[PDB]
Design an enzyme around this catalytic site. Structure first.
Site, PDB file in Angstrom:
ATOM      1  N   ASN A 198      12.618 -38.269 -32.848  1.00 48.03           N
ATOM      2  CA  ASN A 198      11.564 -37.840 -31.775  1.00 48.03           C
ATOM      3  C   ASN A 198      11.709 -39.287 -30.777  1.00 48.03           C
ATOM      4  O   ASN A 198      11.562 -40.467 -31.274  1.00 48.03           O
ATOM      5  CB  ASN A 198      10.082 -38.090 -32.574  1.00 48.03           C
ATOM      6  CG  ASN A 198       9.845 -36.905 -33.440  1.00 48.03           C
ATOM      7  OD1 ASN A 198       9.759 -35.843 -32.698  1.00 48.03           O
ATOM      8  ND2 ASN A 198       9.926 -36.914 -34.646  1.00 48.03           N
ATOM      9  N   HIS A 225      10.240 -29.618 -39.777  1.00 46.38           N
ATOM     10  CA  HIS A 225       9.083 -30.648 -39.772  1.00 46.38           C
ATOM     11  C   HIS A 225       9.501 -31.663 -38.834  1.00 46.38           C
ATOM     12  O   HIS A 225      10.571 -31.930 -38.427  1.00 46.38           O
ATOM     13  CB  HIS A 225       9.291 -31.430 -41.061  1.00 46.38           C
ATOM     14  CG  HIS A 225       8.129 -32.236 -41.479  1.00 46.38           C
ATOM     15  ND1 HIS A 225       7.228 -31.824 -42.469  1.00 46.38           N
ATOM     16  CD2 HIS A 225       7.872 -33.599 -40.962  1.00 46.38           C
ATOM     17  CE1 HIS A 225       6.083 -33.023 -42.197  1.00 46.38           C
ATOM     18  NE2 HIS A 225       6.561 -33.768 -41.382  1.00 46.38           N
ATOM     19  N   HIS A 226       8.011 -31.822 -37.987  1.00 49.14           N
ATOM     20  CA  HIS A 226       8.133 -32.584 -36.611  1.00 49.14           C
ATOM     21  C   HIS A 226       8.874 -33.901 -36.901  1.00 49.14           C
ATOM     22  O   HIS A 226       9.104 -34.707 -36.115  1.00 49.14           O
ATOM     23  CB  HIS A 226       6.877 -32.684 -36.104  1.00 49.14           C
ATOM     24  CG  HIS A 226       7.037 -32.851 -34.633  1.00 49.14           C
ATOM     25  ND1 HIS A 226       7.596 -33.929 -34.025  1.00 49.14           N
ATOM     26  CD2 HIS A 226       6.417 -32.077 -33.593  1.00 49.14           C
ATOM     27  CE1 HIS A 226       7.182 -33.887 -32.712  1.00 49.14           C
ATOM     28  NE2 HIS A 226       6.501 -32.610 -32.559  1.00 49.14           N
ATOM     29  N   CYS A 227       9.098 -34.610 -38.098  1.00 50.73           N
ATOM     30  CA  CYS A 227       9.484 -35.825 -38.225  1.00 50.73           C
ATOM     31  C   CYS A 227      10.850 -35.928 -38.177  1.00 50.73           C
ATOM     32  O   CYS A 227      11.752 -36.878 -38.252  1.00 50.73           O
ATOM     33  CB  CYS A 227       9.061 -36.394 -39.754  1.00 50.73           C
ATOM     34  SG  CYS A 227      10.117 -35.924 -41.077  1.00 50.73           S
TER      35      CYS A 227
END
EC number: 2.3.1.282
Length: 388
Positions: free
Chosen positions: A253, A111-113
């Site tokens: 990120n 998951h990009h989070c």
């Protein structure tokens, strides 16, 4: 903490990925014998080093999203000989191994989070580093668990930084189940690459720098709209920019967004455009625009805002070499793809040099996917030969 407990709420910068159930996948095409038992040990060892990955998201009453902890006793590899449902509320990491002829297909879903391109690549690299140590030795390597990686607004807060800035003038002027995002991909011969590279440092430029020009030019040639500017945006890893440097897994990120309003005419020159872009970046860094602007590259998944020409997003995520693989196994290909939830206005370009070969890519639900990519394709093979 304990499974079931809230680790931490997501930062506004991370919510984009929860709001569009964004997942990132990385697939390595292999050839040889995959010692599944050892591979599973590596995956388990990795998870113990990054216990955050063992969680899921829960939308709080307060509109925000909670990262809730799970157990590591359930997360294991998944061997096979679509068939899969990615779900934020359930898991944020999946290691899928599909056995084949000579070699199988290793695919990591993240998951990009929990990680941007850099953070993820580091994980993917760690995994194979442990597999090699798992097959070579009976041990996948030592495990030192790391704390909850920081969100971008956390990283800035530690520093002075408390809390688009160029596209204001062009303003009004001139998450259910996730589904794979269409991805077109064009390559370049070991030679054609070397030609573009030679042309590169023969103008105090870089592949990425040129590539963007090629992309930006083509966008105008097909926009069927002259003199209308082309807003450009790309990622900038604040890890090597900011104060005490931040390590890849130290933050979730940390990709700042660099804006650039390209104004291409029928005479605009490649190098002219390429150089102007590269220079503008340096000016922004020097002025602290990128560091102090809350702009992050996650905004890419929000397409183009109201009152603005189609934004062109391009990620210079060229990488994945020096990746350890025990004797008998070898990587044949590495493809990256997203799995945000349907209806994600993800119009994005991307490039990377694999095995000394440049690779162009266009991601997102768009008509004539390989249209622009081909226009850009032949353009990167023309400029190096016939420029004078």
């Amino acid at each position: 903490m304990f499974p079931g407990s809230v680790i931490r709420k997501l930062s506004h910068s991370e919510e984009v990925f929860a709001q569009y159930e964004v997942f990132t996948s990385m697939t390595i095409q292999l050839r040889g014998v995959i010692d599944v038992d050892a591979l599973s040990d590596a995956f388990d060892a990795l998870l113990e080093t990054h216990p955050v990955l063992a969680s899921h998201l829960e939308q709080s009453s307060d509109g925000g999203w909670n990262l809730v902890a799970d157990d590591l006793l359930h997360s294991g590899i998944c061997v096979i000989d679509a068939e899969l449902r990615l779900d934020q509320s359930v898991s944020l990491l999946h290691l899928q191994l599909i056995l084949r002829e000579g070699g199988a297909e290793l695919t990591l879903y993240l998951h990009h989070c929990m990680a941007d391109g850099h953070h993820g690549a580091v994980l993917v690299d760690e995994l194979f580093s442990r597999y090699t140590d798992a097959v070579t030795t009976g041990d996948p390597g030592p495990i030192t668990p790391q704390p909850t990686p920081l969100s971008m607004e956390a990283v800035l807060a530690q520093r002075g930084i408390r809390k688009a800035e160029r596209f204001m003038s062009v303003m009004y002027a001139y998450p259910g189940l996730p589904q794979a995002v269409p991805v077109t991909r064009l390559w370049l011969s070991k030679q054609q690459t070397s030609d573009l590279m030679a042309f590169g440092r023969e103008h105090r430029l870089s592949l990425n720098a040129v590539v963007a020009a090629a992309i930006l030019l083509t966008e105008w040639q097909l926009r069927n709209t002259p003199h209308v500017p082309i807003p450009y945006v790309y990622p900038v890893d604040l890890r090597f920019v900011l104060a005490p440097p931040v390590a890849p897994t130290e933050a979730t990120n940390l990709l700042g967004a660099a804006s650039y309003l390209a104004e291409i005419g029928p005479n605009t020159d490649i190098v002219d455009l390429a150089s102007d872009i590269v220079a503008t970046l340096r000016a922004d860094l020097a002025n602290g625009v990128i560091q102090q602007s809350g702009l992050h590259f996650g905004t890419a998944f929000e397409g183009t805002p109201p009152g603005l020409p189609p934004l062109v997003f391009c990620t210079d995520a060229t990488s994945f070499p020096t990746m350890r693989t025990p004797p008998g196994l070898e990587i044949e290909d590495i493809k990256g793809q997203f799995y945000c939830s349907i209806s994600v206005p993800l119009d994005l370009y991307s490039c990377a040099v694999y095995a000394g070969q440049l690779i162009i890519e266009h991601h997102g639900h768009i008509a004539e996917p390989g249209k622009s990519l081909e226009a850009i394709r032949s353009l990167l093979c023309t400029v190096p030969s016939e420029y004078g």
